[PDB]
RNA sequence: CGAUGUCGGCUCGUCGCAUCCUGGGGCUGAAGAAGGUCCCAAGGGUUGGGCUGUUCGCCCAUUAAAGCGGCACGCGAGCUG
RNA sequence: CGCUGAAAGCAUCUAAGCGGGAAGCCCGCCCCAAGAUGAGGCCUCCCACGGCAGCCGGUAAGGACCCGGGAAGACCA
């Protein structure tokens, strides 16, 4: 179950067999493995990956001891890939070949406090015909004396986005190892500059 | 003369093998031990029963067709959140919970009753990690 | 009137060892273990196995017949063995042996490959006859059932997979 | 399969069987097949 | 009765199953294709429009289908009126 | 819907046992999640500090405050 850490760099399209194919570019490698999780030790199998070099002056002592034990340079981010155990001490975009399908996880864009129409595609109200200050309101949220309460999970206004989202089965269109670049067809969660995780897809 | 009230006593750790025993009839006895109602100085408002260790909880037994007809149930608070789990499935997934549930239902409700339940340690399989307390083996 | 009382003739050389809750039968063709009610008693005599019941209660009466028959099928299984024949009927419909496997051409867009489980052997003498053979009576019958099920006898035509000796009962079309 | 509260022999080939807690009627004539319910 | 705002729509659902569709079956006066009838099944789905305050219903064009009921004939400290 | 099969010499999917079998059930996918007080685990960092399972005090590893900001955001985080 291979995976790698990355930054979302931006979108373009390329031309492939006289087709415009939309791509998201991802700067993925290179990731040093700074800890391995084993069944005997941790109860499961995974690899802790590091990513983006950090100014040592910004790294406190407990984190520093963690890196040093790995014989590893200080890094900005630590993230695990589940059920992955690379043979090397370093994971690069080379683990992916064009044509492979990948799942991409990122932090979606934050919309802050979102209304019922933006968050849940509610229909809101009429904009004329007498409608009174409810153009974007949810309408009814319940019944009457039975049950005399509101369901857990009721769709209502509130914060929306800046949350973990995984998009599945994205086609790897190209990989450019000398630049640690991954091209994935289509759309990936979050802003340019966002941290993402790229994994081999779980769909068959 | 006032009725005797005990100063705190070193609780007694007890070990029980559940293998082949009837689920409910074993539970009633574990509850009694938990409450400490076997002790002549029993006092209802303090935790003074035994600590009960149970092993081979997975090998608990049950009569009739209960393996497939006894349903454990859980409500999540959400619409349609009623979960139905048959005995067979519970035994095949979290076996120790079968006895735990049986006993919990036989303890008083309330703060003391909840505290008593924590003094029950149920293990599937023949082993427990409590050698340190040197549990005294109990035939029941 | 009583199957359970009927003595089981044991041909030499097949051996019947009784055990708690089970009896093991060995013969020239293989061995079989028969699961047997602890309430029943299984008795080994000279060239004969017998089964006795503890009482005339309805359950014991029921287990008795069952047990003698079960043991008897085991005895027959390791000596004679068991077979079931299938007749394929219909113009395009044929079978052939592919390694150990049975390959049915019975009018689907594809052929059907049936895999022998352990203790089961397929034979295809004619293209329209299949034989399933093995020491285990219920297994032989099960697999033969499976193969027939692939394409059951039509209600309107003499077409499909038949048990040998199965009557062709048809209904009028139009 | 006929499903009804009164299941009965329809012809002299009909056999009333009890199977898994239910009364069935089985017969060589498929029409006569009954399950109580 | 020192007040429990009553039709219909909109919004938002959620539940029942005596199931409209999709999935699985038996019987058929089941050749096939298409149906009929009963059984299992509530996971999801169940269109847009003309008329009329309408609910309902009729009609137009489609559809896999254009299900029926409960929730104070669900929902006016949510809107309409 | 079957296999094997008595009671009930036949028969029976069943009484012992075994197959097959739904968009439905359990899992599998995605998201939250140890206040899971049953408060879990692993890696790393500090250290046995003064006076009087408690108190005062100065520290350590760390953290907060304050400031420049941010596709994070009502404030807060
Ligand atoms: Mg290219
Ligand atoms: Mg992220
Ligand atoms: Mg935002
Ligand atoms: Mg809104
Ligand atoms: Mg919108
Ligand atoms: Mg939205
Ligand atoms: Mg609208
Ligand atoms: Mg309007
Ligand atoms: Mg609008
Ligand atoms: Mg107005
Ligand atoms: Mg307005
Ligand atoms: Mg509203
Ligand atoms: Mg009201
Ligand atoms: Mg209520
Ligand atoms: Mg947020
Ligand atoms: Mg962006
Ligand atoms: Mg006792
Ligand atoms: Mg019982
Ligand atoms: Mg468990
Ligand atoms: Mg209780
Ligand atoms: Mg009480
Ligand atoms: Mg002999
Ligand atoms: Mg005798
Ligand atoms: Mg016709
Ligand atoms: Mg008659
Ligand atoms: Mg018959
Ligand atoms: Mg009134
Ligand atoms: Mg008043
Ligand atoms: Mg009043
Ligand atoms: Mg009033
Ligand atoms: Mg009032
Ligand atoms: Mg409704
Ligand atoms: Mg129904
Ligand atoms: Mg259907
Ligand atoms: Mg159908
Ligand atoms: Mg047809
Ligand atoms: Mg016709
Ligand atoms: Mg039909
Ligand atoms: Mg029917
Ligand atoms: Mg039926
Ligand atoms: Mg449904
Ligand atoms: Mg539902
Ligand atoms: Mg529905
Ligand atoms: Mg309409
Ligand atoms: Mg007009
Ligand atoms: Mg209209
Ligand atoms: Mg109308
Ligand atoms: Mg009009
Ligand atoms: Mg009308
Ligand atoms: Mg009219
Ligand atoms: Mg059409
Ligand atoms: Mg149709
Ligand atoms: Mg209603
Ligand atoms: Mg009414
Ligand atoms: Mg009315
Ligand atoms: Mg109303
Ligand atoms: Mg209404
Ligand atoms: Mg209303
Ligand atoms: Mg109003
Ligand atoms: Mg109204
Ligand atoms: Mg109201
Ligand atoms: Mg009100
Ligand atoms: Mg209100
Ligand atoms: Mg009100
Ligand atoms: Mg209006
Ligand atoms: Mg008016
Ligand atoms: Mg038959
Ligand atoms: Mg038979
Ligand atoms: Mg049985
Ligand atoms: Mg099966
Ligand atoms: Mg089965
Ligand atoms: Mg079958
Ligand atoms: Mg199965
Ligand atoms: Mg599907
Ligand atoms: Mg998480
Ligand atoms: Mg914690
Ligand atoms: Mg956590
Ligand atoms: Mg709890
Ligand atoms: Mg912890
Ligand atoms: Mg753990
Ligand atoms: Mg400092
Ligand atoms: Mg700010
Ligand atoms: Zn009949």
Swiss-Prot record, chain A:
Entry comment on modification after translation: The mass differences between the observed and calculated masses are suggested to be due to methylation, which is known to occur in the E.coli and R.palustris orthologs.
Position of the signal peptide: none
GO terms for MF: rRNA binding; structural constituent of ribosome
GO BP annotations, alphabetical order: translation
Any coiled-coil regions, as ranges: none
Keyword line: Methylation, Ribonucleoprotein, Ribosomal protein, RNA-binding, rRNA-binding
InterPro entries membership: Ribosomal_uL3, Ribosomal_uL3_bac/org-type, Ribosomal_uL3_CS, Transl_B-barrel_sf
GO cellular component, one term: cytosolic large ribosomal subunit
Quaternary organization: Part of the 50S ribosomal subunit. Forms a cluster with proteins L14 and L19.
Family membership: Belongs to the universal ribosomal protein uL3 family.
Stated role: One of the primary rRNA binding proteins, it binds directly near the 3'-end of the 23S rRNA, where it nucleates assembly of the 50S subunit.
Protein name: Large ribosomal subunit protein uL3
Source species of the chain: Thermus thermophilus (strain ATCC 27634 / DSM 579 / HB8)
Lineage of producing organism: Bacteria, Thermotogati, Deinococcota, Deinococci, Thermales
From Swiss-Prot, chain B:
Classification via Pfam families: Ribosomal_L13
Entry GO MF terms: mRNA binding; structural constituent of ribosome
Gene Ontology biological-process entries: negative regulation of translation; translation
Coiled coil stretches, renumbered: none
GO cellular component, one term: cytosolic large ribosomal subunit
PROSITE patterns given in the database record: RIBOSOMAL_L13
Keywords attached to this entry: Ribonucleoprotein, Ribosomal protein
Main function: This protein is one of the early assembly proteins of the 50S ribosomal subunit, although it is not seen to bind rRNA by itself. It is important during the early stages of 50S assembly.
Quaternary assembly: Part of the 50S ribosomal subunit.
Similarity annotation: Belongs to the universal ribosomal protein uL13 family.
Name under which the protein is recorded: Large ribosomal subunit protein uL13
Taxonomic lineage from the root: Bacteria, Thermotogati, Deinococcota, Deinococci, Thermales
Swiss-Prot record, chain C:
GO biological process, one term: cytoplasmic translation
Keyword rRNA-binding on entry: yes
Protein task: This protein binds to the 23S rRNA, and is important in its secondary structure. It is located near the subunit interface in the base of the L7/L12 stalk, and near the tRNA binding site of the peptidyltransferase center.
Family per record: Belongs to the universal ribosomal protein uL6 family.
Subunit structure: Part of the 50S ribosomal subunit.
Species annotation: Thermus thermophilus (strain ATCC 27634 / DSM 579 / HB8)
UniProt keyword terms in alphabetical order: Ribonucleoprotein, Ribosomal protein, RNA-binding, rRNA-binding
Name of this chain's protein: Large ribosomal subunit protein uL6
UniProtKB/Swiss-Prot annotation, chain D:
One GO location term (cellular component): cytoplasm
Annotated SUPFAM superfamilies: Ribosomal protein L36 (SSF57840)
Positions with a binding annotation for Zn(2+): 11, 14, 27, 32
Keywords: Metal-binding, Ribonucleoprotein, Ribosomal protein, Zinc
UniProt keyword Hydrolase present: no
GO MF annotation terms: metal ion binding; structural constituent of ribosome
Cofactor binding description: Binds 1 zinc ion per subunit.
Pfam families in the record: Ribosomal_L36
Family membership: Belongs to the bacterial ribosomal protein bL36 family.
Assembly and binders: Part of the 50S ribosomal subunit.
Protein name: Large ribosomal subunit protein bL36
């Amino acid at each position: 179950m291979k995976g790698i850490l990355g930054v979302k760099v931006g979108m373009t399209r390329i031309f492939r067999d006289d087709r415009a194919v939309p791509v998201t570019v991802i700067l993925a490698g290179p990731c040093p493995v700074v800890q391995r999780r084993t069944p005997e030790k941790d109860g499961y199998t995974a690899v802790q990956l590091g990513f983006l070099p950090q100014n040592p002056k910004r790294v406190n002592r407990p984190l520093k001891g963690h890196f040093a034990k790995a014989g590893v340079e200080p890094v900005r981010i630590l993230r695990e890939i589940r059920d992955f155990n690379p043979e090397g001490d370093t994971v690069t975009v080379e683990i992916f070949k064009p044509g492979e399908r990948v799942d991409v996880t990122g932090t979606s864009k934050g919309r802050g406090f979102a209304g019922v129409m933006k968050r849940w595609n509610f229909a809101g109200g009429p904009d004329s015909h007498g409608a009174h200050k409810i153009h974007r309101h949810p309408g009814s949220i319940g019944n009457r004396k039975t049950p005399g309460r509101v369901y857990k999970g009721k769709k209502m206004a509130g914060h929306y986005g800046a949350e973990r989202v995984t998009v599945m089965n994205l086609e790897v269109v190209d990989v450019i190892p000398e630049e640690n670049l991954l091209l994935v067809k289509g759309a990936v969660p979050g802003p340019n500059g966002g941290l993402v995780i790229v994994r081999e897809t779980k769909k068959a | 003369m006032k009725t005797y009230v005990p100063k705190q006593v070193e609780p007694r750790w007890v070990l029980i093998d559940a293998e082949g025993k009837t689920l409910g009839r074993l539970a009633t006895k574990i509850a009694t031990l938990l409450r400490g109602k076997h002790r002549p100085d029993w006092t209802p408002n303090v935790a003074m029963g035994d600590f009960v260790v149970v092993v081979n909880a997975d090998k608990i037994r049950v009569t009739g067709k209960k393996l497939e007809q006894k349903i454990y149930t859980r409500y999540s608070g959400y619409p349609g959140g009623l979960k139905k789990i048959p005995l067979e499935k519970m035994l095949a997934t979290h076996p120790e919970r079968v006895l735990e549930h049986a006993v919990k239902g036989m303890l008083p409700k309330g703060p003391l009753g909840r505290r008593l339940f924590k003094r029950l340690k149920v293990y599937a399989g023949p082993d427990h990690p409590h050698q340190a307390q040197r549990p005294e083996k109990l035939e029941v | 009137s009583r199957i359970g009382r009927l003595p089981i003739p044991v041909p030499k050389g097949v051996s019947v060892e009784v055990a708690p809750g089970r009896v093991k039968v060995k013969g020239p063709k293989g061995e079989l273990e028969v699961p047997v009610s602890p309430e029943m008693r299984v008795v080994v005599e000279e060239g004969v196995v017998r089964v006795e019941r503890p009482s005339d209660e309805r359950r014991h009466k029921s287990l008795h017949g069952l047990t003698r028959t079960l043991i008897a099928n085991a005895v027959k299984g390791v000596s004679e063995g068991y077979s079931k024949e299938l007749l394929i009927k219909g113009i395009g419909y044929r079978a052939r042996l592919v390694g150990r496997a049975l390959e049915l051409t019975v009018g689907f867009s594809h052929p059907v490959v049936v895999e022998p489980p352990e203790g089961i052997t397929f034979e295809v003498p004619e293209p329209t006859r299949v034989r399933v053979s093995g020491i285990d009576k219920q297994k032989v019958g099960q697999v033969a059932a499976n193969i027939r099920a692939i394409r059951k006898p039509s209600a309107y035509h003499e077409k499909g997979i038949y048990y040998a000796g199965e009557p062709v009962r048809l209904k009028p079309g139009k | 399969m006929k499903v009804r509260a009164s299941v009965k022999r329809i012809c002299d080939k009909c056999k009333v069987i009890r199977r898994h807690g239910r009364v069935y009627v089985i017969c060589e004539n498929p029409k006569h097949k009954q399950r109580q319910g």
